[PDB]
Design a protein around this ligand. Structure first.
Ligand SMILES: *[C@@H]1O[C@H](CO[C@@H]2O[C@@H](C)[C@@H](O)[C@@H](O)[C@@H]2O)[C@@H](O[C@@H]2O[C@H](CO)[C@@H](O[C@@H]3O[C@H](CO[C@H]4O[C@H](CO)[C@@H](O)[C@H](O)[C@@H]4O)[C@@H](O)[C@H](O)[C@@H]3O)[C@H](O)[C@H]2NC(C)=O)[C@H](O)[C@H]1NC(C)=O
Ligand SMILES: *[C@@H]1O[C@H](CO[C@@H]2O[C@@H](C)[C@@H](O)[C@@H](O)[C@@H]2O)[C@@H](O[C@@H]2O[C@H](CO)[C@@H](O[C@@H]3O[C@H](CO)[C@@H](O)[C@H](O)[C@@H]3O)[C@H](O)[C@H]2NC(C)=O)[C@H](O)[C@H]1NC(C)=O
Ligand SMILES: *[C@@H]1O[C@H](CO[C@@H]2O[C@@H](C)[C@@H](O)[C@@H](O)[C@@H]2O)[C@@H](O[C@@H]2O[C@H](CO)[C@@H](O[C@@H]3O[C@H](CO)[C@@H](O)[C@H](O)[C@@H]3O)[C@H](O)[C@H]2NC(C)=O)[C@H](O)[C@H]1NC(C)=O
Ligand SMILES: *[C@@H]1O[C@H](CO[C@@H]2O[C@@H](C)[C@@H](O)[C@@H](O)[C@@H]2O)[C@@H](O[C@@H]2O[C@H](CO)[C@@H](O)[C@H](O)[C@H]2NC(C)=O)[C@H](O)[C@H]1NC(C)=O
Ligand SMILES: *[C@@H]1O[C@H](CO[C@@H]2O[C@@H](C)[C@@H](O)[C@@H](O)[C@@H]2O)[C@@H](O[C@@H]2O[C@H](CO)[C@@H](O)[C@H](O)[C@H]2NC(C)=O)[C@H](O)[C@H]1NC(C)=O
Ligand SMILES: *[C@@H]1O[C@H](CO)[C@@H](O[C@@H]2O[C@H](CO)[C@@H](O)[C@H](O)[C@H]2NC(C)=O)[C@H](O)[C@H]1NC(C)=O
Ligand SMILES: *[C@@H]1O[C@H](CO)[C@@H](O)[C@H](O)[C@H]1NC(C)=O
Ligand SMILES: *[C@@H]1O[C@H](CO)[C@@H](O)[C@H](O)[C@H]1NC(C)=O
Lengths: 48, 126, 432, 96, 96, 48
C-alpha cells in the first residue's frame, strides 16, 4: 500500500461499486479534479 | 445500515440518518424550518396592516402559516393571506409575481390582489 | 479589370434565426438558515459576529427587479393588443406556423412549441411543499436540499402565456398593419402592397414584386418550412439559453456542496461540535465556520452581479433589435440578418427571444462591359442613378442590384463639360 | 517566478499571421469588389466607379469624382503618407 | 441672419484612425502549487480545508474561451480569402 | 496562511472577470464597426 487519493462511488444501497485512483494517469487526475466519472469531448487544464 | 454503521451523512456532511440504539430501526432526520415568505405593505405611513405570501403552501379548499386571517386564498404565486381578490384587471402597482399584482384600494381601504393587464384591447380588421 | 462589372440577374428570399438571452433566474438567500441551520447557539453567535446579510439581500433583490425590467423592456413595446386574424394567408404568404392555432389547446405557435421543447429545465413550478420533500427523501432531490439550506428561487412576474400573447400581438400587427417608423396608430394595408413598399425600401421596383408574387410567396413558405424542419431535428441551436440555465443551477448546487468545508475547524458538523465541547471551546470552531460560510455567500453574490450585468447588456441589444428590425426596416449592414433586410418576426423562447429575419439576396450574376461616361455630340453624359452597360449589341442603363437594361434617354442622364476630361469615356448616341 | 508559483499564460488560438491574412483579404476585397450591404458574393467593379457610387451615396454627383479624379487620388495618397509619418514618430497613439 | 446662407465651394479627403482593444491574455492558476508549493503536509492540510478553486478555474477558463470568441467575431467576418492583387494602383489610388 | 492565499486568488479572479466584461463590450463595438464601416457605407453621424 501507498498513501494516495481515491474517489469512491456509493450506489443507491450504500455499497461501494467503483473507484478512481487519482494518480494513475492524467485522465484520472482530471476525473478527480472535476469530481465526475464521465468527461465530455474537449481540452482541459491539469496540474503543473 | 451495515452492523458497523451507526450514523449517515449527506453530501453537505449533515447527519441525516441514524440507527435507534434500542430497537435498531433506521430513521431519517429532517430540518424543521422550510418555506419562503414575503410581506406586502402599502407603507407604514398609510397603514400598519400587511398581507403575507407563502410560496410553498397550497391553501386550496396543519397549514404552515403563522396566522390564518380573513381573505385567505391561493394564487399562482402561493397562498396569500390578508388581501381581497377582485376580478377586474389594472396596471401593476405592486408586483407579486406569476402575473399577479396587488394594490391599496377603497373597499376605509384594503389590500387587493388581481391579475395584471397587458395592454389596451383593439381589433384592426384586415 | 477596369472595364467590366458583374450584375445580379436573379434573387431569392432567405429567413435566418437569431437567439438572444433576456433574463435569468431570481434568487434569495436566508443567511441565518444557511449558516446556522436550526441551532439557537449558532444564531446567537452569528448575531454577536455582525453578519452582513442585509447587504447581500439588497444586491440580490436589485438583480431580481432588473430581470423583470429586462423582460418588460423587450416584449411590451406595443401598447395595443391586436387580435389574431381568422385568416392566415394574406396573398399566398402562409403565417399559420408563427401564430397560435385556435383548434389546438396550446396558447403558443408551432415554432414556439418546438423552441420550448429544445431547452430542458429542472425547476418547473416554483412550489415545493414540505410534505413532498419529506415523502420523497430517498430521491435526494437537489431542490429539496437547496430549500432546506435556505436558498429560494422566485417566479418571474410575466408568465409564459403573457409573453406568448405579446409575441402573437406583434406578429398580427406586422401582418395586418405593417408599421413604418414605430408603434403609433395602426394603418391597415394589404400584405402584398406592404411587401412592395419594403422592396422599394431596398431599391427595387414594385413591378418586380407584383409580377413574381407567386414565386416570392412560395420561397417565403419554403424558408419557413426549412426553419421548422431544422428546429425539429435535435441540435444545439439554443445553446445560449441552456448555458444560462446550467450556470444558475451549478452556482446553487456548488453553494449547497460547500457546506462540508472545515475552514480550519475540527469539524464541519455543528451538532458534533456542540455535543463534544462546552460553550467557550465551541465558540472558536463556530466562529471559524461562520467566517467561511459568509465568504462563500459573498462569492456567490458577486458572481451573480457580474452575470446579471452581462444579461442586461444582452437584453438591451435584444430590445434595440426588436425596435429597429420588427417595427421598422433597417439600413444598417448585417444588423437584422444577412443581406438586404425586408422584415422580422419575434418568437418567445425559455428566458429569451428568437428573431426570424426575412431578407433579399441577389444571385445568378453575369458580367458586362461598362464605361464611366458617354460622349455624345461632343458632350459628356453621366447617369443620375445607375450604370452604363453593354450587353453585346447596344448600350443601356442598368441598376447595380438588379439587371434591367433601359434605353439611354435624356430623362435618366445629365450633361457636364466636354469629352476631353473624363478618363475612359466612350462615344455613343442618346435618344430623346 | 510566475511559473514557479503556478501561474500560466496560454497562447491565443489565432496567430498573428492568421489575423494579418484576414486583414489582407478584407482590404483586397474592398479594393476589388467593395461589397455593399454585406459580404454576400463579390461583384467586381473598377475602383473609380466604386468611388463615384459612394459619392452618390453621400449625395454628390458622379461628375465631381470623375472630373477631379487625379486631385482626389493625390489627396488620398497624401493622407495615407501623413498617417504613416505620424505613426513613425514616437507617441502614445496606441495607449489603450 | 434670416436672409443669408453659407454654402461650401470645395472639399477635401481626410483619413483618420481609431484604435480598439479586442482581447486580453488568457491565464490559468495551479491551486496547490501557489498555496503550498512542494510541501506534502501543506497539501494534505489544504485537502482537509476544502479549497474552492475548481470554481476559480471554471471562471478563468470561461474568460479564456471568451477571448478567442472576441477575436473570431471581429476578424473572421468574410468567408472567402481573396488573394492579394499583383497591381496596387487602381486608378491612382495607391494601396501599397 | 491558506486562508490568506485563497483570499488573494479570489480577488485576482474577480478583477479578471470585471476586466473581461469591459473587453467584451469593446470587442462587440469593434465587430459592429467592422460590419458597418468596412463592409458598407454608414449614414450614422460620427460612427465611422
Ligand atoms: C393545490 O391543490 C389542488 C388540489 O385540490 C384539492 O385539495 C388539495 C389540498 C389536495 O387534497 C388535492 O388532492 C385536492 O385535489 C390542486 O388543484 C387540483 O389540480 C389537479 C391537477 O391539475 C386537478 O386534477 C384535474 O382536474 C380536472 C378536473 O376537472 C373537473 O374537476 C375540477 C375540480 O372539481 C373542476 O374545477 C373542473 O371544472 C371539472 O369539473 C381535470 O383536468 C382532471 O380530470 C383532473 O381531475 C384537480 O381538479 C384540481 N383540484 C381543484 C379543486 O382545483 C392545485 O393545482 C394545487 N395547486 C398548485 C399550485 O399546485
Ligand atoms: C399553411 O401551412 C399549413 C401547415 O402546413 C404544414 O407546415 C408547412 C410549413 C409545410 O411544411 C406543410 O407541408 C405542412 O403540412 C397548412 O395546413 C396543413 O396542411 C398540411 C398539408 O399541407 C396538413 O397535413 C395533412 O394532414 C392530414 C393528416 O396527415 C392529411 O390530409 C395529410 O396526410 C397531411 O398530413 C395539415 O393538417 C394542415 N394543418 C396543419 C395545422 O398543419 C395550410 O394549408 C397552409 N395554408 C395554405 C393557405 O396553403
Ligand atoms: C505607391 O507608394 C509606394 C511607396 O512610396 C512610399 O510611401 C508613400 C506612402 C509615400 O510616402 C512615398 O513618398 C514613399 O516613397 C511607391 O513605391 C516607393 O516609391 C518611393 C519613391 O516615391 C521609393 O523610394 C525610393 O527608393 C530608392 C532608395 O532610396 C530610390 O529610388 C529613392 O531615393 C527613393 O528613396 C520606394 O523604394 C518605393 N517602394 C517602396 C516599397 O516604398 C510606389 O511607387 C507608389 N505607387 C505609385 C503607382 O505611384
Ligand atoms: C439494492 O438491493 C436490492 C435488494 O437486494 C437484495 O436485498 C437486500 C436487502 C440485500 O440482502 C441484497 O444483498 C439482496 O441482493 C436490489 O434489488 C433486488 O435485487 C435482487 C438481486 O438481483 C433481486 O432478486 C430482487 O428482486 C431485487 N428487489 C427489488 C428490485 O425490489 C437492488 O438491485 C440493489 N440496487 C443496486 C443498484 O444494485
Ligand atoms: C432494550 O430494552 C427494550 C425495552 O426494555 C424493556 O422494556 C422496557 C419497557 C422496560 O421495562 C425495561 O426495563 C425492559 O428491559 C427492548 O424493547 C422491547 O423489545 C421486545 C422484544 O421482544 C418487545 O417485545 C418489547 O415490546 C420492547 N419494549 C418496548 C417498550 O418497546 C429492546 O429490545 C432492548 N434492546 C436490546 C438491543 O436488547
Ligand atoms: C441586348 O439587348 C437587346 C435589346 O433587348 C437585344 O436585342 C433584342 O433581341 C431580341 C431577340 O433576342 C429582339 O426581339 C428585339 O427586338 C431586340 N431589340 C432591339 C433590336 O432593340 C439583344 O439581343 C441583346 N444582346 C445580347 C447579346 O443578348
Ligand atoms: C403619508 O400619507 C399621508 C396621507 O396621505 C400624507 O399626508 C403624507 O404626506 C404621507 N407621507 C409622509 C407622512 O411622510
Ligand atoms: C484599363 O487599364 C489599361 C492598362 O493597360 C489601360 O490601357 C486602359 O486604358 C484602362 N481603361 C480604362 C477605361 O481606364
Amino acid at each position: 500500500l501507498k498513501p494516495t487519493k481515491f474517489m469512491l462511488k456509493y450506489d443507491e444501497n450504500g455499497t461501494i461499486t467503483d473507484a478512481v485512483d487519482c494518480s494513475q494517469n492524467p485522465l484520472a487526475e482530471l476525473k478527480c479534479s472535476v469530481k465526475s466519472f464521465e468527461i465530455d469531448k474537449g481540452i482541459y487544464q491539469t496540474s503543473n | 445500515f451495515q452492523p458497523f454503521q451507526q450514523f449517515g451523512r449527506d453530501v453537505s456532511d449533515f447527519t441525516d440518518s441514524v440507527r435507534d440504539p434500542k430497537t435498531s430501526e433506521i430513521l431519517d432526520i429532517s430540518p424543521c424550518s422550510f418555506g419562503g415568505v414575503s410581506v406586502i405593505t402599502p407603507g407604514t405611513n398609510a397603514s400598519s396592516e400587511v398581507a403575507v405570501l407563502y410560496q410553498d403552501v397550497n391553501c386550496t379548499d396543519a397549514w404552515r402559516i403563522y396566522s390564518t386571517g380573513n381573505n385567505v386564498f391561493q394564487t399562482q404565486a402561493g397562498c396569500l393571506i390578508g388581501a381581497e381578490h377582485v376580478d377586474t384587471s389594472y396596471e401593476c402597482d405592486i408586483p407579486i409575481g406569476a402575473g399577479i399584482c396587488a394594490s391599496y384600494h377603497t373597499v376605509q381601504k384594503s389590500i387587493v390582489a388581481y391579475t395584471m393587464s397587458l395592454g389596451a384591447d383593439s381589433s384592426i380588421a384586415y | 479589370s477596369n472595364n467590366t462589372i458583374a450584375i445580379p440577374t436573379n434573387f431569392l428570399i432567405s429567413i435566418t434565426t437569431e437567439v438572444m438571452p433576456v433574463s435569468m433566474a431570481k434568487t434569495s438567500v436566508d443567511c441565518n438558515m444557511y449558516i446556522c441551520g436550526d441551532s439557537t447557539e449558532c444564531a446567537n453567535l452569528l448575531l454577536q459576529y455582525g453578519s452582513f446579510c442585509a447587504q447581500l439581500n439588497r444586491a440580490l433583490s436589485g438583480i431580481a427587479v432588473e430581470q423583470d425590467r429586462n423582460t418588460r423592456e423587450v416584449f411590451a413595446q406595443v401598447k395595443q393588443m391586436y387580435k389574431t386574424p381568422t385568416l392566415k394567408d394574406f396573398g399566398g404568404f402562409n403565417f399559420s406556423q408563427i401564430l397560435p392555432d385556435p383548434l389546438k389547446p396550446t396558447k403558443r405557435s408551432f415554432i414556439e412549441d418546438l423552441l420550448f421543447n429544445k431547452v430542458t429545465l429542472a425547476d418547473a413550478g416554483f412550489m415545493k411543499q414540505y410534505g413532498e420533500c419529506l415523502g420523497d427523501i430517498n430521491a435526494r432531490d437537489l431542490i429539496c436540499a437547496q430549500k432546506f439550506n435556505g436558498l429560494t428561487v422566485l417566479p418571474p412576474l410575466l408568465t409564459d402565456d403573457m409573453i406568448a400573447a405579446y409575441t402573437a400581438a406583434l406578429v398580427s400587427g406586422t401582418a395586418t398593419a405593417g408599421w413604418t417608423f414605430g408603434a403609433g396608430a395602426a394603418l391597415q394595408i394589404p400584405f402584398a402592397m406592404q411587401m412592395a413598399y419594403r422592396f422599394n425600401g431596398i431599391g427595387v421596383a414594385q413591378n418586380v414584386l407584383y409580377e413574381n408574387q407567386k414565386q416570392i410567396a412560395n420561397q417565403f413558405n419554403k424558408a419557413i418550412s426549412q426553419i421548422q424542419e431544422s428546429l425539429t431535428t435535435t441540435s444545439t441551436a439554443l445553446g445560449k439559453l441552456q448555458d444560462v440555465v446550467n450556470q444558475n443551477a451549478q452556482a446553487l448546487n456548488t453553494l449547497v456542496k460547500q457546506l462540508s468545508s472545515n475552514f480550519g475547524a475540527i469539524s464541519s458538523v455543528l451538532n458534533d461540535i456542540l455535543s463534544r465541547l462546552d460553550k467557550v471551546e465551541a465558540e472558536v470552531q463556530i466562529d471559524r465556520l461562520i467566517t467561511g460560510r459568509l465568504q462563500s455567500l459573498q462569492t456567490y453574490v458577486t458572481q451573480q452581479l457580474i452575470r446579471a450585468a452581462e444579461i442586461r447588456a444582452s437584453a438591451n441589444l435584444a430590445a434595440t433589435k426588436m425596435s429597429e428590425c420588427v417595427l421598422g426596416q433597417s439600413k444598417r449592414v448585417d444588423f437584422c440578418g444577412k443581406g438586404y433586410h425586408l422584415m422580422s418576426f419575434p418568437q418567445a423562447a425559455p428566458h429569451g427571444v428568437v428573431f426570424l429575419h426575412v431578407t433579399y439576396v441577389p444571385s445568378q450574376e453575369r458580367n458586362f462591359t461598362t464605361a464611366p461616361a458617354i460622349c455624345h455630340e461632343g458632350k459628356a453624359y453621366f447617369p443620375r442613378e445607375g450604370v452604363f452597360v453593354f450587353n453585346g449589341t447596344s448600350w443601356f442603363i442598368t441598376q447595380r442590384n438588379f439587371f434591367s437594361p433601359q434605353i439611354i434617354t435624356t430623362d435618366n442622364t445629365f450633361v457636364s463639360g466636354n469629352c476631353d476630361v473624363v478618363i475612359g469615356i466612350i462615344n455613343n448616341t442618346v435618344y430623346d
